[PDB]
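Supplementary material to the annual report.
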Amino acid sequence: SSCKRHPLYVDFSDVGWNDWIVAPPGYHAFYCHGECPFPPADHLNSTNHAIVQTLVNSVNSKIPKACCVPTELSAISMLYLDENEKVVLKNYQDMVVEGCGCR
Amino acid sequence: SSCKRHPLYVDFSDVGWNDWIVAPPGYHAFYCHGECPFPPADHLNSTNHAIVQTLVNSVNSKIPKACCVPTELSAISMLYLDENEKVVLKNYQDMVVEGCGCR
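Predicted assembly:
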């Protein structure tokens, strides 16, 4: 199982966020999971350090492989109540995973 | 063990990179490891999605917690031989971990 994007729906109720987030009720946030390959994957986004750590891992194991994380994020708009109970329409950055990579 | 930076010295020999990297012999690359807290840490860099995934994790466990990764990287200069055996002095980006965070 290599580093790839996975489905994930968040219900603001489960996390108890529905007490301040008017709408939406929840959303598709997605998430990243998977093993960072070696030899390093081709069409897979990766930083120099991540490549180096992946190599060090093959020889020494006390050092963990690179981690599969969101490399591309988009936002969602939400209707919520702030500190003074003022309805607010705000765009929230970095909420939805659109791409994963090794870091 | 929370998300923090850890010592790590890379020897270009061990990874068999000394065949093309004239100098340096190796360097302090460091790495990141540690558990991404919950409630979410204060002075710890974190993205909205990482906070949301950490929360979903507390209720559902099939979903992994956020990952501890390099959030700040610096470069090191290296002397190496390219494809035509031409000595080259190049600055290499994203080689040294200067800060970790949850993503």
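The first strand of chain A starts at residue 4 and ends at 6.
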